[PDB]
Structures are given as structure tokens and as C-alpha cells.
Ligand SMILES: NC(=O)c1ccc[n+]([C@@H]2O[C@H](COP(=O)([O-])OP(=O)(O)OC[C@H]3O[C@@H](n4cnc5c(N)ncnc54)[C@H](OP(=O)(O)O)[C@@H]3O)[C@@H](O)[C@H]2O)c1
Ligand SMILES: C[C@@H](C(=O)O)c1cccc(Oc2ccccc2)c1
């Protein structure tokens with residue numbers, strides 16, 4: 001329980017993470033209320049939308065300064081009396097809540113997830129795993145022999161959309177930007193990995209899947225979204241999970257050729273369905289429970305990229321978050337990008 005700590009703070013609204021966010025060095029350690037845990041963060045998750053958050057896009061009325069980081073895993077170092085009925089000092093806990101980019105974060109006990117130990121694999125589940133699980137269960141209409149296309153398939157959430165679709169006996173196609181990532185996809189049971197830098201995705205889908213794909217787990221936006229719509233089967237479902245190709249722009253939007261979208265959907269009786277995890281929190285506990293079971297049992301690969309093969313090596317310390325965000329946006333990661341705060 002130190003007097004002071006470091007944390008990241010959004011000091012200016014911008015999708016340029018380095019220009020928006022400051023490493024603040026002499027911050028008091030916040031104290032937990034009656035219903036709160038104080039978590040010493042050991043690993044924190046880097047998420048594409050960290051730059052949407054720094055840009056102010058979740059609530060454009062809220063001015064800087066504000067905390068940042070959506071998820072953490074670590075040890076309970078202090079807690080309020082009511083919280084102590086369910087949690088104990090020293091316990092491993094994980095959470096999805098704002099302000100994880102800090103050495104210590106106050107988290108309401110009611111939203112914390114107990115975990116068996118502090119491993120970065122368990123953090124991969126909190127946002128990336130639950131997003132894939134809930135969207136596909138609630139909106140995917142998966143069943144044996146459906147064809148599922150997953151974009152950013154070798155990324156944090158993509159790896160789960162791939163594996164969970166396979167567990168539903170689907171035939172799965174996955175896009176990624178390298179042969180190393182394609183090999184990773186194959187190792188997860190991907191039926192058709194596509195390196196979109198060396199193989200034209202539109203041609204692959206037209207030639208190999210002429211009747212189309214039944215479900216798209218679409219994270220990329222832009223030209224990839226356009227191709228995905230064209231590739232939809234009759235009654236197919238494209239799920240808008242995100243559009244990372246656009247987040248760095250002033251609006252966060254990626255250009256699409258969507259003027260003909262209503263016509264295309266009518267012609268195919270097909271759909272475009274958005275998904276925002278925070279609209280489905282009633283499903284979160286059950287998703288996390290099943291994901292954790294599969295993770296511990298070794299029935300789910302939870303790939304972690306701690307940056308050990310990045311230019312400057314392992315993502316250690318809050319200062320490495322800047323590098324880690326850049327790494328994501330250079331498309332370099334395989335699995336979930338995680339930063340370690342060692343102690
Ligand atoms: N709807 C929700 O509630 C929700 C929740 C969590 C995440 N998401 C979304 O899921 C997506 C993935 O997020 P993540 O945090 O798991 O990241 P991630 O997939 O681990 O990393 C992003 C990957 O996207 C590709 N990429 C990066 N920059 C790109 C660009 N400029 N243009 C095109 N492709 C680019 C790269 O893979 P390739 O090798 O394939 O290029 C990169 O590895 C994002 O759209 C995010 O907003 C949505
Ligand atoms: C119980 C069964 C089932 O509900 O089909 C199952 C087994 C293994 C992983 C699952 O997780 C998911 C979750 C979403 C989509 C596909 C599979 C779901």
C-alpha cells in the first residue's frame with residue numbers, strides 16, 4: 001500500500017493515443033469504498049477502442065482529465081467491509097471496468113470476476129472472449145455446417161470467434177495479414193485461413209464459397225466490410241463487432257461502399273447487426289463462467305501477445321502501453337495484446 005502511484009490519464013481528446021494520454025507520476029493511491037476492491041494490477045488489456053476512448057467518443061460531453069484502460073487482473077490489496085463478505089486481501093481477481101491503466105484501480109466488488117490465479121490468459125476472456133461468446137450465441141444463429149467468416153481472426157477477439165464457431169461445428173474462414181498468423185489460425189482449427197496481403201479475399205470467397213457465407217464476425221470495416229457484405233449467403237448475417245480500419249481518423253469512421261447496402265440485404269434476405277458488449281451485460285456472467293471453464297481445462301487456446309517479439313521487447317510497465325497500442329495498429333500482434341506491471 002504505497003502513498004503514490006503511476007497511471008495513464010487522458011489529458012487531451014484525440015484518437016492519437018500518444019498525443020491524448022499522459023503518464024502521470026505522483027498520483028495518490030485511491031482508497032476503496034464500502035463495496036469496493038482495490039486491485040493491484042499485474043496485467044492490463046490493450047483494446048482497439050482504447051483510442052476511441054481517448055478520442056472522447058463514448059461521451060463527447062466529458063472533458064479531460066479522465067482515467068483509461070478497460071480491463072485488468074491482479075491481487076486485492078485492500079477492500080471495504082461489505083466487499084470483504086465475498087472477497088479477501090490477496091485474492092486473484094479480474095475485472096472489466098474503466099481506469100485499469102494504473103498501478104492500482106478501485107473496482108466495485110459486484111462486477112469483479114474471481115479467478116484461480118493471476119494469469120494473462122484469464123484476462124483475454126474479460127472483453128475479447130466475452131464479446132465473441134455473447135455476440136455469436138445471441139446473434140449468430142450458429143449450427144452444424146454454417147459457414148462463418150471471421151476478420152482480424154488472429155487477434156484478441158478473433159481467436160475466440162474462430163474457436164467458438166468451430167465448437168459449434170461450423171466451417172470457419174479467417175482473415176489475417178501474415179503467413180505466421182495463418183499458421184496460428186490453422187492451429188486453432190481454422191478451415192480456411194487467408195493472408196489478405198498475399199491472397200485476394202474477394203476472389204477466394206467467390207471461388208471457394210460461391211453460395212456465400214452464413215455469418216460474418218466483422219471487426220475491420222472499410223473494404224473488408226464491403227467484401228463481407230457481397231459474400232453473404234441467402235439469409236446471411238453480418239455482425240458489426242467493430243471497424244478498426246477507421247478508428248484513427250478524426251471521426252473514427254472507415255469509408256465503405258454502402259449506398260447499395262439496403263438493396264443487397266433485401267436481395268439476399270440478409271442482415272447487418274451491430275453488437276455492443278455493454279448492451280448485453282445480463283449475459284456476461286454466464287459467458288465468463290463458461291469461458292473460464294474452457295480456459296482452465298485447456299479446451300480453449302487463449303493466446304497472449306506480451307510483445308516479447310516486438311521491436312523493443314516485452315510490454316512491461318505503463319509506459320509500454322503506448323508501444324503496445326502502436327503494435328496493434330501496425331497489425332503486428334497474434335492474440336490478445338497484454339501489458340505486464342511487474343511486482
Ligand atoms: N463490439 C464490441 O463490444 C467490441 C468489444 C471488443 C472489441 N471489439 C472490436 O474488435 C476488433 C478487434 O479489437 P481487438 O482489441 O481484439 O484487436 P486485435 O484484433 O487484437 O488487433 C487488431 C488487428 O486488426 C488488424 N488491423 C489493425 N489496424 C488495422 C487497420 N488500420 N486496418 C485494417 N486492419 C487493421 C490487425 O490484424 P490483421 O493481421 O488481420 O490485419 C490487428 O492485429 C476492433 O474492431 C474492436 O473495436 C468490439
Ligand atoms: C454448450 C455448447 C453450445 O451452447 O453450443 C457450447 C460448447 C462449447 C463452446 C460453446 O461456446 C460457444 C459460444 C458462442 C458460440 C459458439 C460456441 C458452446
Ligand SMILES: C[C@@H](C(=O)O)c1cccc(Oc2ccccc2)c1
Nearest residue numbers: 116117118119121122295296297298
Ligand atoms: C487452477 C489453475 C490456476 O491456478 O490458475 C491452473 C492450475 C494448473 C495449471 C493451469 O494452467 C493454465 C494456465 C493458464 C491458462 C489455463 C490453464 C492453471
